[PDB]
Design a protein around this ligand. Sequence first.
Ligand code: HEM
Length: 153
Amino acid sequence: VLSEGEWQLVLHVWAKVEADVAGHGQDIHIRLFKSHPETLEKHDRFKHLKTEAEMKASEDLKKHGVTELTALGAILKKKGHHEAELKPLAQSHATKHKIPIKYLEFESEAIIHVLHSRHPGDFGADAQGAMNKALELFRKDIAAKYKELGYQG
Ligand code: HEM
């Protein structure tokens, strides 16, 4: 897992995310959908959003990003002790939304990208390493729950 100092770095940059959860989520989704377009195909109501401005103007997308980042922020604040709130997330992502773990990696890449774009002075190498470890732990643990529910990563 992570050292206490690594968790502290994670929670330090997450409080910066929390000054604008909506805007970070929008930037993350726009990056994700651009970098990895197959990901958009999993979102039936965002597919008509053909341009960056349409994506930013969509309150449905903006709310979706806050919902995702809120759940992730709560997980990160448990500092690895997150079985109770990983279970429902794996349940829906595995059996309803059908999201491969590789897509969770794509979204992690977008998260790290946006964190650096917005907070370069507060997202240096040690903090980046910490966040990747924290997101890697999240993905590892949800991948195991995917298998417990059946059907692989
Ligand atoms: C940091 C990783 C992610 C987190 C924490 C997260 C969290 C959530 C949460 C909390 C919800 C609402 C409750 C539920 O349906 O479970 C949700 C919905 C959803 N997520 Fe994720 N998500 C993540 C990644 C992804 C990715 C990468 C995809 C698609 C490539 C995705 C697709 C969806 C879809 C389709 C819904 C339903 C939206 C709706 O119909 O309103 N999620 N997610």
